[PDB]
Paper text:
However, analyses of the formation of TF complexes on DNA have revealed that many TFs also bind together across the family boundaries, in a DNA-dependent or DNA-facilitated manner. Because the DNA-bound TFs are fixed at particular positions relative to each other, the contact surfaces required for cooperative DNA-facilitated binding are very small, and can evolve rapidly. We also generated an unseen test set by solving six structures that represent several TF–TF–DNA complexes bound to optimal DNA sequences. The structures included two BARHL2 homodimers with two spacings, HOXB13 homodimer and TEAD4–HOXB13, MEIS1–HOXB13 and FOXK1–ELF1 heterodimers.
Numbering used by the authors:
A (entry chain N): 40 to 112
B (entry chain A): 217 to 278
Write the structure that this text describes.
DNA sequence: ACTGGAATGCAATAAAAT
DNA sequence: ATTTTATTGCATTCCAGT
């Protein structure tokens, strides 16, 4: 196992599927002062499901590393 | 895997001269160099990383 | 002013050429 | 055995969109 433990990974694979099925949406995250984003809402759900924290740049990096892997099939 | 391609005398005479002139690259430089060198921008990006790493390695044993 | 995402950096590492 | 290209797993920095 590494940084993204498989237990966290699956929380990320839920977070993905139950925030977007395929990305989507035009910035309907702020109505009051609550300014959210995809990654941050992922990191949040990781906290709510694992207790383990992990910041928005980790969620940034991870997605990019995955994309790379996918592309180099 | 893979195969590793060894860049020619021209390719490296180009690179070494530009590294000597400056240690890291900027897009402007990758582009210009890439044209003259006949290599990928990607490759250039790496060659600099590695060339640096070679320099770092030589600041080690006493 | 906030953000997600691309580009870039770096350490570890692999393997062909020398 | 050392040197020269190339990749991978993170982080960190740079570029826009809203």
């Amino acid at each position: 196992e590494g940084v993204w433990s498989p237990d966290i990974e699956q929380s990320f694979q839920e977070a993905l599927a139950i925030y977007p099925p395929c990305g989507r949406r035009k910035i309907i995250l702020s109505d009051e002062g609550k300014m959210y984003g995809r990654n941050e809402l992922i990191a949040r759900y990781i906290k709510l499901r694992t207790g383990k924290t992990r910041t928005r740049k980790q969620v940034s990096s991870h997605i990019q590393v995955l994309a790379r892997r996918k592309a180099r099939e | 895997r893979k195969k590793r391609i060894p860049y020619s005398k021209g390719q490296l005479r180009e690179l070494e001269r530009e590294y000597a002139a400056n240690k890291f690259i900027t897009k402007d430089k990758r582009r210009k160099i890439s044209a003259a060198t006949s290599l990928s921008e990607r490759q250039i990006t790496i060659w600099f990383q590695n060339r640096r790493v070679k320099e770092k390695k030589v600041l080690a044993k006493v």
